[PDB]
Amino acid sequence: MRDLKTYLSVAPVASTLWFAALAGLLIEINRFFPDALTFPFF
Amino acid sequence: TVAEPDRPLWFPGSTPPPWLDGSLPGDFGFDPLGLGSDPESLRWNVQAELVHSRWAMLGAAGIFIPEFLTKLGILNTPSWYTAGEQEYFTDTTTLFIVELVFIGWAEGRRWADILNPGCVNTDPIFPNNKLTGTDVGYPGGLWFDPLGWGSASPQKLKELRTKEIKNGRLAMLAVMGAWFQHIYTGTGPIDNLFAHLADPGHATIFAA
Amino acid sequence: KKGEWLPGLASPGYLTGSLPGDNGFDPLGLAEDPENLKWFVQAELVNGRWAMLGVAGMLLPEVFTSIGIINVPKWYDAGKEEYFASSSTLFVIEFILFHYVEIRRWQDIKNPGSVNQDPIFKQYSLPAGEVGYPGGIFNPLNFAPTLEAKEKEIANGRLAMLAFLGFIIQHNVTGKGPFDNLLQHISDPWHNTIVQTL
Amino acid sequence: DIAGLTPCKDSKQFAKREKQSIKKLESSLKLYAPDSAPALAINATIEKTKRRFDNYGKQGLLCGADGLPHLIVSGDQRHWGEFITPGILFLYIAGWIGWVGRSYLIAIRDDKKPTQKEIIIDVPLATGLVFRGFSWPIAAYRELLNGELVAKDV
Ligand SMILES: CC(/C=C/C=C(C)/C=C/[C@@]12O[C@]1(C)C[C@@H](O)CC2(C)C)=C\C=C\C=C(C)\C=C\C=C(C)\C=C\[C@@]12O[C@]1(C)C[C@@H](O)CC2(C)C
Ligand SMILES: CC(/C=C/C=C(C)/C=C/[C@@]12O[C@]1(C)C[C@@H](O)CC2(C)C)=C\C=C\C=C(C)\C=C\C=C(C)\C=C\[C@@]12O[C@]1(C)C[C@@H](O)CC2(C)C
Ligand SMILES: CCCCCCCCCCCCO[C@@H]1O[C@H](CO)[C@@H](O[C@H]2O[C@H](CO)[C@@H](O)[C@H](O)[C@H]2O)[C@H](O)[C@H]1O
């Protein structure tokens, strides 16, 4: 169990989980706010 | 706190894990994937099972009792599945944000007790009240144990806590039961009970 | 036991408790360096004091206007009004005066007790106090600068800073002033919330 | 307007691009049935195209002779949303990333094997440090004045 959690903290797995969460967030941001060449809220 | 080597196990004939010795209530040696091997994860998941059990027992009653009496000529409660789509005295998002604030307070003090036992057992305004319980997950005090069945000798407390976790495991299966039933079937779970009692050999999962 | 901002969390070591308003609150560790702690204490005092005066000058003239006793412009519309001087002249006056006062206070922050005397009149100096609490003419009523008193000053400053943070963000999304928001909420709180405003 | 450009709300080429794009999607739409799923997909793309062009023309974007939004990064206050404002947002995020990673490297530099916590992340330590970047311009500025940001004599 502790060894399994230590494996999940290795560089590639932490990178995938972190970049997957990051990719999903940016996808939803461009899904609710598509296009946008500017910062429109001024 | 009282280990039991010859306790009735989940899999009769097998060997219990070294980290499940029978001191916990509802201990049947069931952990094939070793999710609670280390003591830190064991105590955290023990609190997780306890809170899961209590919420699911409230949910099991909130489904199976109103859905039962409304089928009878007694009540008018709508379906538990569609109870969210209903409109109450204010919009759902306001009820949820209020619930988040108030339940967040209760869970915040509950989290402080889990990470640091005993450091939250006093009222931060009127210090004389306090909570009497000494075990994590069993706060005691006047609010959460007024009748006093919770401060007793061991064995007896172990019997009652075994009853609690067992009913909660049954309720967790019961709540998920009603969920996947109302997805598979298109009616209330009391209709599933009556449909099965009407034809137990045919009115099963193999009916669609 | 000095007061716990989080009953479970322990207090940081560098926050001894000798400071008024100490509740062990510094999750990001911005005041770990004692010099950062010394500078941020003055920053909290001045920000809290300006927020207290600001919240008062924003709320109290408006409630007295909505009641009917006076007719004073709202805090966001008080700038567009016409005054006896050009707004640019008002800016330069405020800049020059604060460019003198704030730097005199800053000399005390770096070097304590170095600006206690009047450079124009050699006499009429300030007695020795603490940084952020200048004695003498700045305390005419001769109150007692002590605990609780200093703790209430910091507590009111913290609530007023949160109050200013509420006023600006409310006025942005609600369009009106603070007292109008409270009246709109008081009429029907279950249907006049930030949930309904958005 | 600026640099000889005309605002996209005034440009004819900008509106002709919106027309030709929508008409091209409509030409793909006639091939499918009105209740079809490709039809609802193409209709949603058309509505998304109208929304995009309208938003660009509404926020004061300048257009060239090509009918395409040109950005002005000289600092003109009419177009701070085109660079300076998103750039400040980036610098806030970039400083956050660098400051948190720096806090992590400082915290593990005194470990027995500092390389161990670099190839196997200490997630508890990371989760406690990720929110220090929220106040990174302050913590960094103070470390600049106190001589803590730069190593002496390197
Ligand atoms: C079943 C369940 C979890 C089961 C998990 C199991 C068996 C895992 C087994 C193992 O891991 C172990 C143990 C050991 C490992 O080595 C091996 C495996 C095999 C992996 C949870 C249910 C949990 C179910 C819960 C907690 C339900 C709570 C219900 C609530 C709160 C109420 C909801 C409602 O209120 C609404 C929303 C609307 C109202 O109308 C109606 C009501 C019903 C009132
Ligand atoms: C100064 C101030 C307001 C001053 C307002 C003024 C003068 C208003 C003036 C006028 O209105 C009048 C009167 C009349 C109007 O006609 C004209 C104007 C001009 C409008 C607000 C400060 C406001 C200051 C605020 C809100 C500060 C908040 C800081 C917080 C919450 C920090 C918390 C933490 O940093 C710790 C402590 C520990 C870390 O580890 C974690 C975190 C969480 C980061
Ligand atoms: C040790 C196992 C013993 C089980 C033995 C069961 C043997 C049953 C007799 C052989 C099969 C007869 O065939 C079956 O008979 C059963 C009686 O059970 C009846 O079955 C009926 O069950 C319920 C009972 O109300 C009805 O609602 C349903 O509509 C119908 O399926 C049917 O008439 C026929 O489908």
Tokens 């070793």 sit on residue = B34
Question: What Rg do the C-alpha atoms of chain A give, in angstroms?
Answer: 16
* Residues paired with residue C97 on neighbouring β-strands, in sequence order: none
Ligand 3 contact via B101 beta carbon (within 6 Å):
no
Architecture of C34-196 per CATH?
A: Orthogonal Bundle (1.10)
Nearest ligand 2 atom to alpha carbon C28: 40
Tokens 């519309």 sit on residue = C77
Measured CA to CA in angstroms, residue D96 lies from D68, D90, D91, D149 at distances of 34, 10, 8, 15
To 10 degrees, what angle do helices C34-67 and C149-174 make? 60
Measured CA to CA in angstroms, residue B103 lies from B97, B108, B123 at distances of 10, 8, 17
For chain C, give every domain's residue range.
34-196
Please name which ligand lies nearest the alpha carbon of B11. 1
What secondary structure, in 3-state letters, does chain C show?
CCCCCCCCCCCCCCCCCCCCCCCCCCCCCCCCCHHHHHHHHHHHHHHHHHHHHHHHHHHHHHHHHHHCCCCCCCCCCCCCCCCCCCHHHHHHHHHHHHHHHHHHHHHHHHCCCCCCCCCCCCCCCCCCCECCECCHHHCCCCCCCCCCHHHHHHHHHHHHHHHHHHHHHHHHHHCCCHHHHHHHHHHCHHHCCHHHHC
Give, using CA atoms, the residue closest to atom 28 of ligand 1: B56
DSSP string, D57-79: HHTT-EE-TTS-EEP--S--GGG
> What is the spatial distance between Cα B10 and Cα B16, in angstroms, rounded to a whole number?
9
Give the chain C residue nearest D127 (alpha carbons): C28
If one counts every other C-beta atom within 10 angstroms of the C-beta of residue C85, the result is 10
Which chains does D contact via 3+ CB–CB distances below 8 A? Answer: A, C
- Dihedral (Cα; C76, C77, C80, C84), 10-degree rounding: -100
Go through the domains of chain B in sequence order and give each one's CATH number.
Answer: 39-198 (1.10.3460.10)
> What is the spatial distance between Cα B205 and Cα D138, in angstroms, rounded to a whole number?
62
Tokens 């969460």 sit on residue = A21
Give the HSE-up count for residue B16: Cα atoms under 13 Å, Cβ half-sphere: 19
Ligand 1 contact via B65 beta carbon (within 6 Å):
no
Tokens 């006049």 sit on residue = C192
- ∠ at Cα B143 (B141, B145), nearest 5°? 60
> Is the CB of A37 less than 8 angstroms away from the CB of D82?
yes
Question: What Rg do the C-alpha atoms of chain B give, in angstroms?
Answer: 21
Write phi, then psi, for B22 (nearest 5 degrees).
100, 5
Measured CA to CA in angstroms, residue C77 lies from B77, C88, C183, D141 at distances of 53, 17, 19, 35
> What is the spatial distance between Cα C128 and Cα D78, in angstroms, rounded to a whole number?
52
Measured CA to CA in angstroms, residue C145 lies from B139, C39, C133, C136, C180 at distances of 43, 20, 8, 12, 37
For chain A, give every domain's residue range.
1-42
Distance of alpha carbon D20 from its chain centroid, rounded? 28
Structural contact between residues C54 and C34, judged by C-beta atoms closer than 8 angstroms: no
> Is the CB of C29 less than 8 angstroms away from the CB of D132?
yes
Give, using CA atoms, the residue closest to atom 28 of ligand 2: C161
> What is the spatial distance between Cα B15 and Cα D72, in angstroms, rounded to a whole number?
74
Structural contact between residues B132 and B140, judged by C-beta atoms closer than 8 angstroms: yes
B180: helix, strand or coil: helix
What technique solved it? Answer: X-ray
Nearest ligand 2 atom to alpha carbon C162: 26
State the amino acid at position D16 in one-letter form: K
Which contacts (CB < 8 Å, 24+ apart) does range D115-120 have?
D119/A10, D119/A11, D120/A6, D120/A9, D120/A10, D120/A11
> What is the spatial distance between Cα D92 and Cα D140, in angstroms, rounded to a whole number?
12
Q: Would you call D23 an interface residue with chain C, using a CB distance cutoff of 8 Å?
A: no
Structure tokens at B93: 């998002």
Contacts of residue B7, Cβ cutoff 8 Å, sequence gap at least 6: B16, B22, B27, B28, B29
> To what resolution in angstroms was this structure determined?
3.0
Distance of alpha carbon D33 from its chain centroid, rounded? 38
For chain D, give every domain's residue range.
1-154
Residue A21 CA to ligand 1 center (angstroms) comes to: 26
State the amino acid at position C41 in one-letter form: V
DSSP string, B131-176: ----BTTB--HHHH-SS-TTS--TTHHHHHHHHHHHHHHHHHHHHH
What's the topology of domain A1-42? 1.20.5
- Any idea what DSSP says for residue B28? -
Contacts of residue D79, Cβ cutoff 8 Å, sequence gap at least 6: A38, D60, D62, D71, D72
> Is the CB of B97 less than 8 angstroms away from the CB of C195?
yes
Give the chain A residue nearest B40 (alpha carbons): A2
Ligand 1 contact via B176 beta carbon (within 6 Å):
yes
Nearest to D130 by CA among D101, D109, D110: D101
Structure tokens at D2: 């600026």
State the amino acid at position B48 in one-letter form: A
Residue C136 CA to ligand 3 center (angstroms) comes to: 102
Is C86 within any annotated ligand binding site?
Answer: yes
Give the chain B residue nearest C4 (alpha carbons): B124
> What is the spatial distance between Cα C166 and Cα C158, in angstroms, rounded to a whole number?
12
> Is the CB of C8 less than 8 angstroms away from the CB of B115?
yes
Which contacts (CB < 8 Å, 24+ apart) does range A18-25 have?
none
> What is the spatial distance between Cα D103 and Cα D122, in angstroms, rounded to a whole number?
13
Write phi, then psi, for B156 (nearest 5 degrees).
-65, -50
Structural contact between residues B121 and B130, judged by C-beta atoms closer than 8 angstroms: yes
DSSP string, chain A: -HHHHHHHTBHHHHHHHHHHHHHHHHHHHHHHS-S-SS-TT-
Give the chain C residue nearest D148 (alpha carbons): C33
> What is the spatial distance between Cα D90 and Cα D98, in angstroms, rounded to a whole number?
12
B43: helix, strand or coil: helix
- ∠ at Cα B138 (B132, B139), nearest 5°? 40
Give the HSE-up count for residue B182: Cα atoms under 13 Å, Cβ half-sphere: 15
Nearest to C198 by CA among C157, C170, C178, C179: C170
Structural contact between residues B61 and B174, judged by C-beta atoms closer than 8 angstroms: no
Give, using CA atoms, the residue closest to atom 38 of ligand 2: C26
If one counts every other C-beta atom within 10 angstroms of the C-beta of residue B9, the result is 16
Best mutation site among C36, C41, C42 for testing chain D: the one with the most D CBs within 10 Å?
A: C36
If one counts every other C-beta atom within 10 angstroms of the C-beta of residue A22, the result is 10
- Any idea what DSSP says for residue B8? P
The helix or strand, by DSSP H or E, that contains position D99, with its residue range, turns out to be helix D84-108
Structure tokens at D40: 């609802």
> What is the spatial distance between Cα B130 and Cα B142, in angstroms, rounded to a whole number?
8
The helix or strand, by DSSP H or E, that contains position B190, with its residue range, turns out to be helix B189-198
Q: Which residues of D touch A38 (CB under 8 A)?
A: 59, 61, 71, 79, 81-82, 86
Where on the phi/psi map is residue D3: left (φ > 0), alpha (ψ -120 to 50), or beta? Answer: left
Best mutation site among A1, A2, A4, A5 for testing chain B: the one with the most B CBs within 10 Å?
A: A1
Is B44 within any annotated ligand binding site?
Answer: yes
Structural contact between residues C154 and C45, judged by C-beta atoms closer than 8 angstroms: yes
- Measured between its terminal Cα atoms, the distance across chain C in Å is 42
Structural contact between residues C132 and C37, judged by C-beta atoms closer than 8 angstroms: no
Contacts of residue C186, Cβ cutoff 8 Å, sequence gap at least 6: none
Tokens 């450009």 sit on residue = D5
The pairing of beta strand D69-70 with beta strand D62-63: antiparallel
Measured CA to CA in angstroms, residue A22 lies from A19, D64, D126 at distances of 5, 35, 16
Structural contact between residues B53 and B171, judged by C-beta atoms closer than 8 angstroms: yes
- Any idea what DSSP says for residue D120? B
Residue B120 CA to ligand 2 center (angstroms) comes to: 32
- ∠ at Cα B199 (B194, B201), nearest 5°? 130
Which chains does A contact via 3+ CB–CB distances below 8 A? Answer: B, D
D115: helix, strand or coil: coil
If one counts every other C-beta atom within 10 angstroms of the C-beta of residue B112, the result is 19
Residue B56 CA to ligand 1 center (angstroms) comes to: 6
